[PDB]
Symmetry: C4
Subunit: 173 residues, 4 copies
């Protein structure tokens, strides 16, 4: 797992799928027409740390909600692409808007729409409950599951590849 650090070493943009990654994949509705989505605290600190080391954060999700916009604002996720199933076009599109190579993009997803972004990114990540064929195509599969530390895990991972992790920890000791 040192060859993982090799691939995360020059990452400048970290892009995330939402449902199944930042959440546990539950889509929650109520009888007054209200939707709800749940996230994980520790993913929050992790993304703030990552972003803090200079890495830019993006969300690319096929679904569309205000709570994705809310979670994103508070963690400094700056590029928020909702209602877009084509993750690679979306991501290549960001590549060009920021002047950053794909080989310096990290992408985490958990299902078929995520497959090509995961395969084509410089660093491609999936989760234990990701679909088999997205997993098969990724550089890394997290130990922690989605909505339960998977994103935190990757955040620590890239921090450590870029020699930025211990220093962030040291901030709290």
């Amino acid at each position: 797992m040192n060859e993982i650090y090799q691939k995360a070493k020059h990452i400048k943009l970290f892009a995330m799928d939402v449902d199944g990654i930042l959440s546990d994949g539950q889509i929650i509705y109520n009888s007054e027409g209200t939707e709800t989505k749940a996230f994980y605290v520790q993913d929050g600190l992790g993304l703030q740390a990552l972003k803090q080391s200079g890495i830019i954060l993006a969300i690319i999700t096929g679904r569309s909600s205000a709570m994705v916009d809310r979670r994103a604002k508070e963690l400094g996720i700056s590029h928020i692409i909702q209602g877009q199933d084509d993750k690679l076009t979306a991501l290549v599109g960001l590549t060009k808007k920021l002047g950053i190579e794909l080989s310096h993009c990290a992408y985490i997803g958990d299902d078929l729409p995520d497959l090509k972004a995961v395969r084509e990114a410089g660093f491609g990540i999936s989760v234990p409950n990701g679909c088999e064929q997205t997993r098969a195509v990724s550089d890394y599969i997290t130990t922690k599951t989605g909505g339960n530390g998977a994103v935190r895990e990757v955040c620590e991972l890239i921090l450590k590849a870029q020699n930025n992790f211990d220093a962030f920890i040291a901030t709290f000791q």
Copy 2:
């Protein structure tokens, strides 16, 4: 598990129970008289894929809610029978409305009201936390639990019996 593909081979209608199958069986209420129900993302893609291969989707649930109507609309579940505990009459009734044999119906349920629909369908499915006697009567018991990929699993299963799965995957590679 090739004899499972044999039974799913000529399925034209896939019917689902809701609570315990598309959800994890939690019935959620709040102090302002509002009900809520949670579904799983990966079940969503799966049902869209199934429906896409020409299979028609139905919901038959003893309970009645607007969020069942919401989830159904977005996944293209076209026949939505709520407040009906008698699943087999309901299902036989659909049989006749669509001109489709029962032996070409697939049914997944997880409790006693589902038992006869599961036993009488051409392809009968239950889940690990289904009641013992519905399980005992089904052609297949999923590995993934309800509200956690059980429906996705069956969706891939019928896609593969009907030689439609790899092609759907190929759409994302």
Copy 3:
């Protein structure tokens, strides 16, 4: 576990704790002052079956909510004691209102306020995540956990002690 059937044989009233028994013990609040509580479908069918065999159902909970009243109405839980921590006085009080002996009362609870009702009932039940000393005092500890089939399990148990279970199942075959 035939000596369990011996104690459930002449039960006429089944009383339940709410939080940790019918729910998984989560107390859920939101930022607009709204409380929510989650129940399990399979517990619902089970309580309807039990009640159906002539057994009367009661709720005794130290907390107080409208969703306890909602869940109770729909399952035919007819006696609903909220904001009462003293479960045994509450239960003895029901004893006298219905002309039914305590030795013919079943009680399930999961924490210290439930301890004496569990110890003094004719049939006393707790759950795996119940506190140690309520468990130590109960005739039966369920396999399924609270808000996840514990109540269903007990319901089947008393049905079977009273030779009423197979017949209820037969209704669905």
Copy 4:
């Protein structure tokens, strides 16, 4: 684990992190701009028992919500510090407001902002899913997880160090 009782023996203030400790770390939003947070019943009784033995309770959380204020009021958590990430300054600040030494403070947390409060408290606690470096620095790691009895466990622990537990149990037998 008798050396744990040694450190909890003279505790007079028990301070808690919120997200990941009293909750399971989920941050829940809905499409009408509403946030929700879930707590555990058994943690409630436990904190009431602890407080009852004369111990004063405080919340120190980096996040800010009305449901933290609600949960706190009902359990008698009397000092509620929200929107404050610096837990040790916050806690030392309470030290001085109550005339109580830090060595007589207990602190439970689960992530980096909690690390120094956990290390510097007379009794420092973390949970199984706490970050590695906060855990490494704590006197005790609970068996039960956050939002699932971790706080209850610690509550019983300090009660027992201070010879107050059996007596509290005896109140229910």
